Amino acid sequence: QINLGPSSNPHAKPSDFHFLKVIGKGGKVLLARHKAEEVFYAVKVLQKKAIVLLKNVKHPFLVGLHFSFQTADKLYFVLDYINGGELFYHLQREACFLEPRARFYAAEIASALGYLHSLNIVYRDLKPENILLDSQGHIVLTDFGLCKTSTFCGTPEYLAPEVLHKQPYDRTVDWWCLGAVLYEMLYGLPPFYSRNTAEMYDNILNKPLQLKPNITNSARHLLEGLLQKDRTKRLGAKDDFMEIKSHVFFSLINWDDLINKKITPPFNPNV
Ligand SMILES: O=C(N[C@@H]1CCNC1)c1cc(-c2ccc(NS(=O)(=O)c3cccc(Cl)c3Cl)cc2)nc2n[nH]cc12
């Protein structure tokens, strides 16, 4: 019987919902419709045996928690249901995005990362699997840790080199992940990618970054800096979000209009 902070609805019980599909799994996430205002929600059920109030984590590009409740064995978090689907589902259809499109997504991710870092939070696991698109076309991040081999293929790796060789990591890992997510939007594959897992990990940890010729010098400088193996030399080490915010690549971004959703998304998902 954990107090669950102030987001607690002492009246809510799982009986108040209709659980359609299990949309995420590990502790899983479900799609459910409320039996009042017939509104669609995403409910994250965890399960007690998995042993920090917070939940004032409100950002335009992060999932919102409406309320939370508990049974006496399962833990439920009623979150916003995001309609537009994964961002990299759209990347698969097109192979790669143009720089204006990628700039918009990396700008929305950078401001959400900067906000998390101001709350002393580290995403650590920023994967395309966790980057969704709302019905209007804006970035909304999920799985930012608020609550919890193979020879070939192997699930793509976005973790910074220091995380891979179990070393002290900080907010700078998120700036590596931003560079990896951005590299993929531009080139079509995750950085250092190989079908051979041993080869891919060897690239990530010991091989210099291979930036191919068809991106602007601005994007190239940003990826070079964001994808720095040494966390002390990486973009974001000195003054976090402020270095990203001012970079040549984000010249066209008015950061105020960006957070106030006054910039039209470069694509609207048909929903
Ligand atoms: O479709 C989703 N996930 C699929 C599984 C991987 N590919 C996509 C999805 C997940 C969550 C979701 C996932 C993880 C979390 N994680 S959490 O720790 O960061 C968190 C954030 C904010 C408040 C709270 Cl209480 C929590 Cl626990 C929260 C929401 N929300 C959603 N809304 N609509 C869709 C949602």
SS3 62: strand
The residue type at 266: P
What resolution in angstrom units was achieved for this structure? 2.5
- Token digits for 29? 């996430």
Compute the distance from residue 81 Cα to the ligand 1 centre, in Å: 9
- Token digits for 214? 């068809």
Dihedral sign for Cα 42, 7, 38, 35, please: positive
Is 57 annotated to bind a ligand? Reply is: no
CB 155 within 8 A of CB 193: no
Architecture of domain 85-260: Orthogonal Bundle (1.10)
Is 24 annotated to bind a ligand? Reply is: yes
Active-site hit among 80, 125, 134, 230? 125
**Look-up of token digits 């590299």:** 183
**How does DSSP classify residue 63?**
P
Q: Give the integer Cα–Cα distance in Å for 4 and 11.
A: 14
- Token digits for 268? 């609207």
- Nearest alpha carbon, ligand 1 atom 16: 143
Dihedral sign for Cα 249, 252, 254, 259, please: negative
Q: Give the integer Cα–Cα distance in Å for 236 and 153.
A: 31
- Nearest alpha carbon, ligand 1 atom 23: 65
SS3 195: coil
Phi, psi of 264 (to 5 degrees): -70, 130
Q: Give the integer Cα–Cα distance in Å for 57 and 192.
A: 33
Q: At what angle do helices 172-187 and 217-226 cross, to 10 degrees?
A: 140
Closest CA to 163 of 146, 149, 180, 147: 180
Q: Does the annotation mark 174 as catalytic?
A: no
Compute the distance from residue 257 Cα to the ligand 1 centre, in Å: 26
**In terms of residues, how long is the chain?**
271
Using a 10 angstrom Cβ sphere, with 0-12 exposed, 13-18 middle and 19 or more buried, the burial of residue 21 is: exposed
Give Cα 163 distance to the centre of its chain: 17
Closest CA to 163 of 182, 177, 150: 177
